[PDB]
Ligand binder design. Structure first.
Ligand SMILES: Nc1ncnc2c1ncn2[C@@H]1O[C@H](C[C@@H](N)CC[C@H](N)C(=O)O)[C@@H](O)[C@H]1O
Ligand SMILES: [Zn+2]
Ligand SMILES: [Zn+2]
Lengths: 295, 120
């Protein structure tokens, strides 16, 4: 099938407008009929396909970009997603990652512990989360909004994300947060992207591109997640990893992006159109210097 | 892992691992192999993946015995030369950690000193 050759699928806009009832997901494809290029870890394929999608957005990509990656550790003690991000991001990008448990990473800095205690107080240009807690989910008969590390993610969007910055947050059918969905209404563009490699999973990446700090649309988070599940329920994908054989354009190009420490009183009409194009990040401009960055 | 823990207990993690390989040990696993276009120049340790069709490219930290064993590197004042970069090895290889520990990077052309470097 031709659709197996794209990096994945993003939520059609019409689904974003529905009022779907909450229901269990049921995928037609649990037999996982996809092969991975020889020797290739699943999360390498997964993160690579995510970055392939992000290559098509108006991501703000300056010099000395600040990238925070939460939930970057694995049970084997390495960081496959952080390796992909390091490959993807322009040289000199400040990549900092985090996990509850010790692991070994190609980021310039790693912090072990609850993301809540992350000791860096700077504003970020891009936040990626793969945080996920299996079957410690809210018990009950109802799939309800979760408040774990999501509380921290929402706080980082509200206070620690530059205007013009973006996020990509892993969610699943049970691992989701209603406020996070509402905050996607504060970006120039938002969707949920599902990688072709992991098409057999309810996993999606909830993505906001170009933060505006003002509600551009009003989203009921509880309804929106149900809409996302309704979309997974009414589509059938083989899955696939063929896009992984097209790597010539993988690296994220510097976008023509400026960083300006603008005041809240200088955010006029032009600024906003610049933010929506990935041309402007609003935050303090100083190069954040980490001990482990080869400078 | 048992070998990584033996390495971290020992004064010379490199010797301990290489001796262990020579004695029938099974190689360190879960090295992070990247996807790339294999149109690279083929240098050993690079800012981004740089493999030719003759090479695999790995996340540097995952192929560093010192990183993997959680012990200090040989130069306590410096930074790991592998962490945060990408390591190219022959495409077959099953023991990338061994390969990294037993080859040297020419310091002017950047290729491995295993028949790829042409200097002097
Ligand atoms: N509050 C939390 N703070 C930091 N990390 C968390 C938290 N909750 C869950 N995690 C981590 O989320 C991770 C989920 C993993 N499946 C991530 C896989 C990893 N991203 C990879 O590249 O393979 C676990 O390593 C958790 O330790
Ligand atoms: Zn190291
Ligand atoms: Zn040379």
């Amino acid at each position: 099938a031709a659709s197996d050759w794209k990096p994945g699928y993003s939520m059609p806009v019409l689904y974003k407008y529905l009022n779907s009832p909450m229901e269990r997901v049921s995928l037609w494809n649990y037999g996982k009929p996809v092969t991975l290029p020889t020797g290739c870890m699943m999360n390498v394929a997964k993160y690579t396909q995510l970055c392939q999608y992000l290559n098509t957005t108006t991501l703000a990509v300056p010099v000395n970009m600040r990238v925070l990656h939460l939930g970057a550790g694995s049970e084997k003690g390495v960081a496959p997603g952080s390796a992909v991000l390091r490959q993807w991001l322009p040289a000199g990008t400040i990549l900092v990652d985090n996990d509850l448990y010790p692991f070994v990473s190609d980021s310039v800095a790693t912090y072990f512990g609850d993301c809540i205690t992350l000791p860096f107080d700077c504003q970020w240009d891009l936040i990626i989360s793969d945080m996920y807690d299996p079957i410690t989910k809210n018990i009950g008969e109802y799939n309800v909004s979760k408040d774990g590390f999501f509380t921290y993610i929402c706080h980082m969007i509200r206070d620690k994300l530059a205007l013009g910055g973006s996020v990509a947050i892993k969610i699943t059918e049970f691992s989701w947060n209603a406020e996070l969905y509402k905050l996607m209404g504060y970006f120039a563009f938002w969707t949920v992207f599902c990688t072709n490699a992991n098409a057999s999973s309810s996993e999606g990446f909830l993505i906001g591109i170009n933060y505006l700090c003002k509600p551009k649309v009003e989203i009921d988070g509880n309804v929106m997640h149900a809409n996302y599940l309704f979309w997974r329920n009414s589509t059938v994908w083989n899955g696939g990893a063929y896009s992984l054989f097209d790597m010539a354009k993988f690296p994220l190009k510097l976008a023509g992006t400026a960083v300006i420490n603008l005041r809240a009183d200088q955010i006029n009409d032009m600024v906003y159109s610049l933010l929506e194009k990935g041309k402007l990040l609003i935050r303090d401009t100083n190069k954040e210097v980490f001990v482990g960055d080869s400078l | 892992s048992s070998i990584l823990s033996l390495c971290a207990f020992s004064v010379d993690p490199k010797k301990t691992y290489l001796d262990f390989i020579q004695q029938g040990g099974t190689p360190i696993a879960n090295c992070v192999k990247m996807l790339c276009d294999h149109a690279g120049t083929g240098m050993a340790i690079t800012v981004k993946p740089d493999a030719t069709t003759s090479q695999d490219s790995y996340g540097g930290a995952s192929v560093c015995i010192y990183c993997r064993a959680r012990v200090e590197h040989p130069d306590v004042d410096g930074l790991c030369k592998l962490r945060g970069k990408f390591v190219q090895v022959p495409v077959g290889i099953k023991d990338p950690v061994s390969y990294v520990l037993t080859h040297d990077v020419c310091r002017v052309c950047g290729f491995w000193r295993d028949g790829s470097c042409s200097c002097v």
